Amino acid sequence: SSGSLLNNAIKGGVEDEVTLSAYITIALLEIPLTVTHPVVRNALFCLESA
Amino acid sequence: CPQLQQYTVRKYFPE
């Protein structure tokens, strides 16, 4: 979380790195993106573990 | 990380 925001009302989450990474990777996956992709692979590792 | 807190001759061709 490179936190440089102004307000947290705009964001509907708790700023956990887990949730942040989760919202990230889901925003990625809504793009048609292969699950074998590196970044998503790492993200999935995080998701599994978390 | 930065501060989080904020507000005889015949010529041939020559050349």
PDB file of N, CA and C in Angstrom:
ATOM      1  N   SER A   1       0.860  -1.180   0.000  1.00  0.00           N
ATOM      2  CA  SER A   1       0.000   0.000   0.000  1.00  0.00           C
ATOM      3  C   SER A   1       0.894   1.227   0.000  1.00  0.00           C
ATOM      4  N   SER A   2       1.100   1.797  -1.186  1.00  0.00           N
ATOM      5  CA  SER A   2       1.772   3.087  -1.316  1.00  0.00           C
ATOM      6  C   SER A   2       0.731   4.177  -1.070  1.00  0.00           C
ATOM      7  N   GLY A   3       0.274   4.245   0.179  1.00  0.00           N
ATOM      8  CA  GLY A   3      -0.782   5.156   0.577  1.00  0.00           C
ATOM      9  C   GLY A   3      -0.460   6.614   0.338  1.00  0.00           C
ATOM     10  N   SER A   4      -1.162   7.207  -0.625  1.00  0.00           N
ATOM     11  CA  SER A   4      -1.033   8.617  -0.967  1.00  0.00           C
ATOM     12  C   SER A   4      -2.405   9.220  -1.250  1.00  0.00           C
ATOM     13  N   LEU A   5      -3.440   8.692  -0.605  1.00  0.00           N
ATOM     14  CA  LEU A   5      -4.815   9.110  -0.827  1.00  0.00           C
ATOM     15  C   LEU A   5      -5.136  10.369  -0.031  1.00  0.00           C
ATOM     16  N   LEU A   6      -6.387  10.813  -0.157  1.00  0.00           N
ATOM     17  CA  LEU A   6      -6.927  11.920   0.620  1.00  0.00           C
ATOM     18  C   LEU A   6      -7.990  11.472   1.607  1.00  0.00           C
ATOM     19  N   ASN A   7      -8.943  10.654   1.163  1.00  0.00           N
ATOM     20  CA  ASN A   7      -9.967  10.111   2.041  1.00  0.00           C
ATOM     21  C   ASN A   7     -10.099   8.621   1.790  1.00  0.00           C
ATOM     22  N   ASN A   8     -10.549   7.910   2.812  1.00  0.00           N
ATOM     23  CA  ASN A   8     -10.776   6.477   2.746  1.00  0.00           C
ATOM     24  C   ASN A   8     -12.237   6.121   2.506  1.00  0.00           C
ATOM     25  N   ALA A   9     -13.134   7.109   2.478  1.00  0.00           N
ATOM     26  CA  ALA A   9     -14.533   6.832   2.171  1.00  0.00           C
ATOM     27  C   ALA A   9     -14.676   6.285   0.762  1.00  0.00           C
ATOM     28  N   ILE A  10     -13.925   6.871  -0.167  1.00  0.00           N
ATOM     29  CA  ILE A  10     -13.895   6.431  -1.559  1.00  0.00           C
ATOM     30  C   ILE A  10     -13.632   4.933  -1.661  1.00  0.00           C
ATOM     31  N   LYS A  11     -12.741   4.410  -0.828  1.00  0.00           N
ATOM     32  CA  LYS A  11     -12.406   2.993  -0.839  1.00  0.00           C
ATOM     33  C   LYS A  11     -13.288   2.257   0.158  1.00  0.00           C
ATOM     34  N   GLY A  12     -13.836   1.127  -0.272  1.00  0.00           N
ATOM     35  CA  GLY A  12     -14.756   0.364   0.546  1.00  0.00           C
ATOM     36  C   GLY A  12     -14.112  -0.830   1.214  1.00  0.00           C
ATOM     37  N   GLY A  13     -12.856  -0.672   1.643  1.00  0.00           N
ATOM     38  CA  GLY A  13     -12.122  -1.750   2.262  1.00  0.00           C
ATOM     39  C   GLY A  13     -11.361  -1.279   3.486  1.00  0.00           C
ATOM     40  N   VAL A  14     -10.635  -2.225   4.078  1.00  0.00           N
ATOM     41  CA  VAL A  14      -9.985  -2.029   5.371  1.00  0.00           C
ATOM     42  C   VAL A  14      -8.480  -1.794   5.237  1.00  0.00           C
ATOM     43  N   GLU A  15      -7.984  -1.637   4.006  1.00  0.00           N
ATOM     44  CA  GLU A  15      -6.592  -1.301   3.712  1.00  0.00           C
ATOM     45  C   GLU A  15      -5.624  -2.418   4.101  1.00  0.00           C
ATOM     46  N   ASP A  16      -6.123  -3.618   4.391  1.00  0.00           N
ATOM     47  CA  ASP A  16      -5.232  -4.753   4.578  1.00  0.00           C
ATOM     48  C   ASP A  16      -4.518  -5.058   3.269  1.00  0.00           C
ATOM     49  N   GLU A  17      -3.222  -5.375   3.363  1.00  0.00           N
ATOM     50  CA  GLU A  17      -2.470  -5.734   2.163  1.00  0.00           C
ATOM     51  C   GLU A  17      -3.090  -6.931   1.475  1.00  0.00           C
ATOM     52  N   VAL A  18      -3.670  -7.826   2.258  1.00  0.00           N
ATOM     53  CA  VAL A  18      -4.375  -8.967   1.702  1.00  0.00           C
ATOM     54  C   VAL A  18      -5.527  -8.499   0.832  1.00  0.00           C
ATOM     55  N   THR A  19      -6.427  -7.710   1.411  1.00  0.00           N
ATOM     56  CA  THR A  19      -7.569  -7.214   0.659  1.00  0.00           C
ATOM     57  C   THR A  19      -7.123  -6.335  -0.494  1.00  0.00           C
ATOM     58  N   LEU A  20      -6.051  -5.569  -0.298  1.00  0.00           N
ATOM     59  CA  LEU A  20      -5.576  -4.689  -1.360  1.00  0.00           C
ATOM     60  C   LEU A  20      -5.072  -5.508  -2.538  1.00  0.00           C
ATOM     61  N   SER A  21      -4.240  -6.504  -2.252  1.00  0.00           N
ATOM     62  CA  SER A  21      -3.770  -7.418  -3.279  1.00  0.00           C
ATOM     63  C   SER A  21      -4.930  -8.151  -3.925  1.00  0.00           C
ATOM     64  N   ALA A  22      -5.951  -8.461  -3.135  1.00  0.00           N
ATOM     65  CA  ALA A  22      -7.095  -9.199  -3.638  1.00  0.00           C
ATOM     66  C   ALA A  22      -7.897  -8.359  -4.611  1.00  0.00           C
ATOM     67  N   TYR A  23      -8.177  -7.121  -4.224  1.00  0.00           N
ATOM     68  CA  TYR A  23      -8.870  -6.197  -5.103  1.00  0.00           C
ATOM     69  C   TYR A  23      -8.045  -5.942  -6.352  1.00  0.00           C
ATOM     70  N   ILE A  24      -6.724  -5.937  -6.206  1.00  0.00           N
ATOM     71  CA  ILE A  24      -5.865  -5.748  -7.362  1.00  0.00           C
ATOM     72  C   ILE A  24      -6.056  -6.900  -8.331  1.00  0.00           C
ATOM     73  N   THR A  25      -5.762  -8.108  -7.872  1.00  0.00           N
ATOM     74  CA  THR A  25      -5.779  -9.265  -8.753  1.00  0.00           C
ATOM     75  C   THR A  25      -7.150  -9.518  -9.342  1.00  0.00           C
ATOM     76  N   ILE A  26      -8.214  -9.208  -8.609  1.00  0.00           N
ATOM     77  CA  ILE A  26      -9.531  -9.360  -9.208  1.00  0.00           C
ATOM     78  C   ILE A  26      -9.733  -8.327 -10.300  1.00  0.00           C
ATOM     79  N   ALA A  27      -9.273  -7.093 -10.075  1.00  0.00           N
ATOM     80  CA  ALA A  27      -9.350  -6.101 -11.138  1.00  0.00           C
ATOM     81  C   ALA A  27      -8.537  -6.543 -12.343  1.00  0.00           C
ATOM     82  N   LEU A  28      -7.475  -7.304 -12.104  1.00  0.00           N
ATOM     83  CA  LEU A  28      -6.716  -7.864 -13.210  1.00  0.00           C
ATOM     84  C   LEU A  28      -7.532  -8.932 -13.914  1.00  0.00           C
ATOM     85  N   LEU A  29      -8.142  -9.812 -13.142  1.00  0.00           N
ATOM     86  CA  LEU A  29      -8.807 -10.957 -13.730  1.00  0.00           C
ATOM     87  C   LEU A  29     -10.041 -10.579 -14.504  1.00  0.00           C
ATOM     88  N   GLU A  30     -10.679  -9.476 -14.138  1.00  0.00           N
ATOM     89  CA  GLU A  30     -11.776  -8.993 -14.955  1.00  0.00           C
ATOM     90  C   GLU A  30     -11.297  -8.643 -16.357  1.00  0.00           C
ATOM     91  N   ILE A  31     -10.037  -8.237 -16.499  1.00  0.00           N
ATOM     92  CA  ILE A  31      -9.437  -8.136 -17.825  1.00  0.00           C
ATOM     93  C   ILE A  31      -9.304  -9.585 -18.263  1.00  0.00           C
ATOM     94  N   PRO A  32      -9.507  -9.909 -19.521  1.00  0.00           N
ATOM     95  CA  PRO A  32      -9.284 -11.292 -19.924  1.00  0.00           C
ATOM     96  C   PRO A  32      -7.808 -11.590 -19.858  1.00  0.00           C
ATOM     97  N   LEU A  33      -7.407 -12.259 -18.790  1.00  0.00           N
ATOM     98  CA  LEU A  33      -6.006 -12.471 -18.484  1.00  0.00           C
ATOM     99  C   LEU A  33      -5.806 -13.912 -18.048  1.00  0.00           C
ATOM    100  N   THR A  34      -4.755 -14.533 -18.573  1.00  0.00           N
ATOM    101  CA  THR A  34      -4.525 -15.948 -18.332  1.00  0.00           C
ATOM    102  C   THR A  34      -4.072 -16.179 -16.901  1.00  0.00           C
ATOM    103  N   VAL A  35      -4.667 -17.189 -16.266  1.00  0.00           N
ATOM    104  CA  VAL A  35      -4.318 -17.532 -14.894  1.00  0.00           C
ATOM    105  C   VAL A  35      -2.878 -17.996 -14.779  1.00  0.00           C
ATOM    106  N   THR A  36      -2.296 -18.471 -15.874  1.00  0.00           N
ATOM    107  CA  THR A  36      -0.889 -18.829 -15.890  1.00  0.00           C
ATOM    108  C   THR A  36       0.033 -17.622 -15.934  1.00  0.00           C
ATOM    109  N   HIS A  37      -0.502 -16.411 -16.006  1.00  0.00           N
ATOM    110  CA  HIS A  37       0.346 -15.246 -16.127  1.00  0.00           C
ATOM    111  C   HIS A  37       1.201 -15.107 -14.866  1.00  0.00           C
ATOM    112  N   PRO A  38       2.415 -14.554 -14.965  1.00  0.00           N
ATOM    113  CA  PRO A  38       3.256 -14.479 -13.755  1.00  0.00           C
ATOM    114  C   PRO A  38       2.631 -13.723 -12.607  1.00  0.00           C
ATOM    115  N   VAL A  39       2.204 -12.492 -12.868  1.00  0.00           N
ATOM    116  CA  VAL A  39       1.703 -11.629 -11.808  1.00  0.00           C
ATOM    117  C   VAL A  39       0.507 -12.277 -11.137  1.00  0.00           C
ATOM    118  N   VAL A  40      -0.399 -12.831 -11.937  1.00  0.00           N
ATOM    119  CA  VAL A  40      -1.574 -13.447 -11.347  1.00  0.00           C
ATOM    120  C   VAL A  40      -1.182 -14.715 -10.628  1.00  0.00           C
ATOM    121  N   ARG A  41      -0.147 -15.395 -11.099  1.00  0.00           N
ATOM    122  CA  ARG A  41       0.323 -16.580 -10.402  1.00  0.00           C
ATOM    123  C   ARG A  41       0.791 -16.225  -9.001  1.00  0.00           C
ATOM    124  N   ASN A  42       1.594 -15.170  -8.899  1.00  0.00           N
ATOM    125  CA  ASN A  42       2.048 -14.708  -7.593  1.00  0.00           C
ATOM    126  C   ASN A  42       0.868 -14.267  -6.745  1.00  0.00           C
ATOM    127  N   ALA A  43      -0.094 -13.604  -7.379  1.00  0.00           N
ATOM    128  CA  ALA A  43      -1.253 -13.121  -6.651  1.00  0.00           C
ATOM    129  C   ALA A  43      -2.045 -14.285  -6.102  1.00  0.00           C
ATOM    130  N   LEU A  44      -2.186 -15.328  -6.900  1.00  0.00           N
ATOM    131  CA  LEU A  44      -2.910 -16.510  -6.484  1.00  0.00           C
ATOM    132  C   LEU A  44      -2.208 -17.203  -5.348  1.00  0.00           C
ATOM    133  N   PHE A  45      -0.882 -17.182  -5.365  1.00  0.00           N
ATOM    134  CA  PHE A  45      -0.146 -17.692  -4.221  1.00  0.00           C
ATOM    135  C   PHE A  45      -0.526 -16.925  -2.965  1.00  0.00           C
ATOM    136  N   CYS A  46      -0.499 -15.594  -3.050  1.00  0.00           N
ATOM    137  CA  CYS A  46      -0.954 -14.765  -1.939  1.00  0.00           C
ATOM    138  C   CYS A  46      -2.375 -15.106  -1.523  1.00  0.00           C
ATOM    139  N   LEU A  47      -3.250 -15.345  -2.490  1.00  0.00           N
ATOM    140  CA  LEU A  47      -4.655 -15.552  -2.178  1.00  0.00           C
ATOM    141  C   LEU A  47      -4.849 -16.853  -1.445  1.00  0.00           C
ATOM    142  N   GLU A  48      -4.267 -17.907  -1.989  1.00  0.00           N
ATOM    143  CA  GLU A  48      -4.263 -19.204  -1.351  1.00  0.00           C
ATOM    144  C   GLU A  48      -3.767 -19.102   0.079  1.00  0.00           C
ATOM    145  N   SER A  49      -2.619 -18.454   0.264  1.00  0.00           N
ATOM    146  CA  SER A  49      -1.985 -18.420   1.575  1.00  0.00           C
ATOM    147  C   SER A  49      -2.811 -17.612   2.558  1.00  0.00           C
ATOM    148  N   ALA A  50      -3.257 -16.443   2.120  1.00  0.00           N
ATOM    149  CA  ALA A  50      -4.036 -15.574   2.977  1.00  0.00           C
ATOM    150  C   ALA A  50      -5.340 -16.245   3.350  1.00  0.00           C
TER     151      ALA A  50
ATOM    152  N   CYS B   1      11.007   4.677   2.981  1.00  0.00           N
ATOM    153  CA  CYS B   1       9.796   5.177   2.373  1.00  0.00           C
ATOM    154  C   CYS B   1       9.527   6.599   2.859  1.00  0.00           C
ATOM    155  N   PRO B   2       8.982   7.463   2.002  1.00  0.00           N
ATOM    156  CA  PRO B   2       8.827   8.874   2.372  1.00  0.00           C
ATOM    157  C   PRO B   2       7.866   9.052   3.536  1.00  0.00           C
ATOM    158  N   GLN B   3       7.680  10.308   3.930  1.00  0.00           N
ATOM    159  CA  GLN B   3       6.834  10.612   5.076  1.00  0.00           C
ATOM    160  C   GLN B   3       5.379  10.340   4.715  1.00  0.00           C
ATOM    161  N   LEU B   4       4.777   9.363   5.395  1.00  0.00           N
ATOM    162  CA  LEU B   4       3.384   9.024   5.125  1.00  0.00           C
ATOM    163  C   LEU B   4       2.450  10.163   5.504  1.00  0.00           C
ATOM    164  N   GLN B   5       2.772  10.888   6.570  1.00  0.00           N
ATOM    165  CA  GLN B   5       1.873  11.918   7.066  1.00  0.00           C
ATOM    166  C   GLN B   5       1.814  13.079   6.085  1.00  0.00           C
ATOM    167  N   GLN B   6       0.599  13.518   5.773  1.00  0.00           N
ATOM    168  CA  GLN B   6       0.397  14.602   4.826  1.00  0.00           C
ATOM    169  C   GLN B   6      -0.856  15.372   5.210  1.00  0.00           C
ATOM    170  N   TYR B   7      -1.017  16.531   4.584  1.00  0.00           N
ATOM    171  CA  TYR B   7      -2.191  17.369   4.791  1.00  0.00           C
ATOM    172  C   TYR B   7      -3.361  16.833   3.978  1.00  0.00           C
ATOM    173  N   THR B   8      50.047   7.153 -79.229  1.00  0.00           N
ATOM    174  CA  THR B   8      50.317   5.897 -78.541  1.00  0.00           C
ATOM    175  C   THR B   8      49.345   5.633 -77.393  1.00  0.00           C
ATOM    176  N   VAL B   9      48.302   6.459 -77.264  1.00  0.00           N
ATOM    177  CA  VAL B   9      47.395   6.390 -76.126  1.00  0.00           C
ATOM    178  C   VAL B   9      45.965   6.606 -76.590  1.00  0.00           C
ATOM    179  N   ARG B  10      45.038   6.003 -75.851  1.00  0.00           N
ATOM    180  CA  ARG B  10      43.609   6.056 -76.145  1.00  0.00           C
ATOM    181  C   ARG B  10      42.878   6.142 -74.814  1.00  0.00           C
ATOM    182  N   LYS B  11      42.350   7.323 -74.519  1.00  0.00           N
ATOM    183  CA  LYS B  11      41.674   7.568 -73.256  1.00  0.00           C
ATOM    184  C   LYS B  11      40.539   6.581 -73.026  1.00  0.00           C
ATOM    185  N   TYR B  12      40.516   6.015 -71.828  1.00  0.00           N
ATOM    186  CA  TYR B  12      39.441   5.184 -71.327  1.00  0.00           C
ATOM    187  C   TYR B  12      38.560   6.070 -70.453  1.00  0.00           C
ATOM    188  N   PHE B  13      37.500   5.527 -69.865  1.00  0.00           N
ATOM    189  CA  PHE B  13      36.623   6.402 -69.105  1.00  0.00           C
ATOM    190  C   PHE B  13      37.351   6.848 -67.845  1.00  0.00           C
ATOM    191  N   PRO B  14      37.386   8.139 -67.534  1.00  0.00           N
ATOM    192  CA  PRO B  14      37.950   8.559 -66.255  1.00  0.00           C
ATOM    193  C   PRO B  14      36.900   8.578 -65.161  1.00  0.00           C
ATOM    194  N   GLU B  15      37.296   9.091 -63.999  1.00  0.00           N
ATOM    195  CA  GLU B  15      36.413   9.311 -62.852  1.00  0.00           C
ATOM    196  C   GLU B  15      36.025   8.008 -62.169  1.00  0.00           C
TER     197      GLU B  15
END
